[model samples]
Target: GSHMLEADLELERAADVRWEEQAEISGSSPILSISIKNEEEEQTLGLEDGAYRIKQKGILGYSQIGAGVYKEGTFHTMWHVTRGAVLMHKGKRIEPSWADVKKDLISYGGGWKLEGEWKEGEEVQVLALEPGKNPRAVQTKPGLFKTNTGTIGCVSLDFSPGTSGSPIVDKKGKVVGLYGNGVVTRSGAYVSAIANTEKS
Candidate 1:
């Protein structure tokens, strides 16, 4: 539905830019529920998409929420709030925002434990929280797969669309990754491992 672009690490521009592989095959997903609250109702963005209430006051910077607002480019990476929004799913807020930032990946906390370790036949299945819904549900294949982005999961259950950036959790509801993108041309998704956002 929209034009997209891929990313390349300039190392020199490493601090400012990153990349994604599916940018070529898929259109922009949709207005994510993880976003700054907008006054009044508007099309192209839904009530659920305005999931975050947003801070009444905040500072701005390169990685700040709304950093890419009105930015001129084929790709936009900044969150809608904070330098990185505090992720919330299933009526609970994910803590610390343990993201690499440079890698554009995050680490979910340690204790919950991602029970289903990846395997060939016994492949662990994680759920990608479906968008536009208050309650969560699995929309992707849920298997762990390494994408051009990083060691994420397959949202392609495939391109379960709309679930972009959704929290990916195991059968026990423990978060394992964040659904970033997917190749609609075939069938796969990008999910950043939440095993340890900052630590590992």
Candidate 2:
């Protein structure tokens, strides 16, 4: 996670950074990837946290991938949104329930689509990061894999301890869900639905 710290510092220094692509660090899920222009060069960063904030009229709200993966002060807001000066979620401001988090994630447009449903036996791919390796050492390509059950059954995707918060897309490359320690405690794996943790 030290690599994420470096990115946080960069975001802190830049005054005109903006969100770029939802890229994967390695073979994990899609994260709030961003870019900043320093002088004449542009720097791209892959944020470790799966949560993001959408600004509308002041501080609207927040959205996260893994619900309970991070506790109170696990993540810093500056690494995700344009204005990270404020701590979005401190106490109970963030809805800790799955139902509420999913609703908010959709409202913020965090990539969950009405057609983003997981079907059993459907080929899916994940972008996860390899542990103990450079964060930029993203995986090249992995073959399409299938879930255990072909129905609404839960599937545990493989991820490194520090490599949570990746987006899970279907064969058509639609962001159906995310991978993280959301509901269940299957460490290094992901459960369905997105989390709406605040900037705290």
Candidate 3:
């Protein structure tokens, strides 16, 4: 059991945990911090002209086994907060705007303003941070379920996660197709969004 180290970061602010001020931190950090020094060398290190320096040689087989399994669904990993944040609700730290999930339509970074098209038994509204203590779109109906990453619209909620890319609104509130990339089968809580049907 020699040694090892690992790290992770991708701040999108939808906390299961990460408390600082607003109690949920979205002010992402680590503007690229890295220090990996390992060697044995020509054991190597040289200087010819291009301001040269090279000294890296080592032994392998440090035992890295791999086998991971996950099921049903619930993974809304969307992180990017290069700076500036303060978000809260319920627990009341009060700040930052608001949001919801999928039909998976994203034109080009801040590109969601599609005024028509949320077929498959119509009537939608998947926007829920439960906006009012278990708030709601108050309803659901978009079983356009025909998987294979083609006709994906399997929306059936009442229990779920960060609402993964939430925003499937309609009924004159307009804008649908994005429900979520969150699905937790057993016949419900599946919020997955990523698809097509002509978006502009």
Candidate 4:
């Protein structure tokens, strides 16, 4: 159990939350779908040959939602800072880092380091963050519940909005996956494989 506790602590130190704002786009062939509220509010913008500016303040914080790519008016991905929240492609001009907008935004590791192969019913730690506090870590066991489009899913545990992108680690502090989206049902949730997304 001591190892689990230590792994939980490490996971907590590796998670962070990125607030979403209105972004003005100006890049070639790049499209953005942003949501500033719950599943009800959303916006899509297409721009060519320029950069996008998310220069609004009130849009920064928890309880704000639908903050990323959407498919048929549903969230495809949560806008995460470390995972290219403000993406620049095709040599587009770079904008100011989101780190500068709010102090204490990135209070942990810049990115998660992934490791190992996983099997069904593996015990892991889920790193999560609640508003106004450092991330909270929970030790849970995950079954090979489901998979879709190269992403794995696990049985649900104590999770919330800020839990998105939380690291899923082994008892020895090795990350194997990440919390992808919300719980699919009362019994399952999606997990992104680290081997496919990040270098070991």
Candidate 5:
């Protein structure tokens, strides 16, 4: 495992910086293939400990796909490509490139919809992330915004289980934040990498 410096929003030199929470998921669940085309097209995938991918549905659009549970102070996950597309899991297909998503000119509503885990049970579990701060998943569309450094437009949401390796998208559906950090330390203060952790 690797380590990273904690994000201190109060020590920022600029005023434009914002604080956000980590996207989380219930730790250690199996990845199932429900078929992007049909439920009849079922399959089981051998999901690794830290793998991620993206899948697209008709109305749901695109979303991040992968595995791993959220822990304190560390992050680790793995991913691979199938048919030239990045396969985060069995039927999940994360959008190919983070650079291709378009920009939002009119509204702040262009992110992807993430649906995984908890889809099996019939309980609409209102997430209890940090007591009263029950969070919601932000639909994403990744791309570069017209900022000074041209940062990717990212909307904040509550972190929960079944959301590991989720992509932060822009208006045009490009990748932005990788969900490596969070609003609190209990969800991990920094983003660590599995393969990318070659150094301390």
Candidate 6:
């Protein structure tokens, strides 16, 4: 159940369509791999010695594709600004401060968090009460954010200023999804996160 989201970053590049099991843009390797996974469960995609770039998803928002490894174990995900759209709320989309987030978990605490670690290959689970709402925790089952001793899969992520279209990976280094938007909560005070819907 995957849809085609276009990118304005490379408006001149071309459009790409992927499935729920395989979602990615053209030239999206290095930092992303809809097909590969590692033992650490980390999406060991892209080399640690190249450049990184971000692209657009059809006509939706911005997204990151592949990265270049500049050094050993030091890969960078490329990002493009301006042409992309920032996440906004119905009320107002204001830049959040550190304090603003803690008060509103939805805006800050909600989405997927990559702690520089994870496992690869095997099945990872999304662990959330409402996996449908949680970005990082995409689930084989509904309302659940899959979790492992390492990575968080299909869960929502509260992408910060420098994290637009950041690749969402599993513990094994598998690129699972993309960071979409942030949640503001019922109170509309704090912030939360959003991510791609499903997992492979």
Per-model lDDT: 0.28, 0.29, 0.30, 0.32, 0.23, 0.27
Candidate 2 has an lDDT of 0.29
- Over 108-173, each residue of candidate 5 has an lDDT whose tens digit, in order, gives 112222212111111122111111111233332222122233222222333432243443322222
Candidate 1 TM-score over all chains jointly = 0.34
Tell me the tens digit of each residue's lDDT in model 1 across 15-70.
11111122212422222222443222211122111112111121331110111100
| Steric clash count of candidate 2 | 11
lDDT of 4 at 124: 57
Error of 5 at 191 (Å): 13
**What is the per-residue lDDT of model 4 for residues 53-95, given as tens digits with 9 covering 90 to 100?**
1211233321322121111211112334333233222333222
How many backbone clashes are present in model 1? 6
> After superposing candidate 6, which stretches have Cα over 4 Å from the reference?
1-51, 54-159, 189-192, 198-200
Ordered from best to worst lDDT, the candidate numbers read: 4, 3, 2, 1, 6, 5
Cα deviation in Å at residue 114, candidate 1? 6.9
Weakest 10 consecutive residues, lDDT, candidate 3? 46-55
lDDT of 4: 0.32
Which residue pairs in candidate 4 have backbone atoms (N, alpha carbon, C) closer than 3 angstroms, thus clashing? 24-52, 24-53, 26-50, 27-49, 27-50, 28-49
Which candidate has the highest lDDT of all? 4
Top candidate by TM-score:
4
- Which RMSD values do the candidates have, in order? 14.8, 13.0, 20.4, 18.7, 18.6, 17.2
TM-score result, candidate 4: 0.39
Error of 6 at 138 (Å): 18
Query: What TM-score would each prediction reach against the true structure?
Result: 0.34, 0.33, 0.21, 0.39, 0.24, 0.25
User: How far out, in Å, is residue 125 in model 1?
Assistant: 6.0
TM-score of candidate 6 to 2 decimals? 0.25
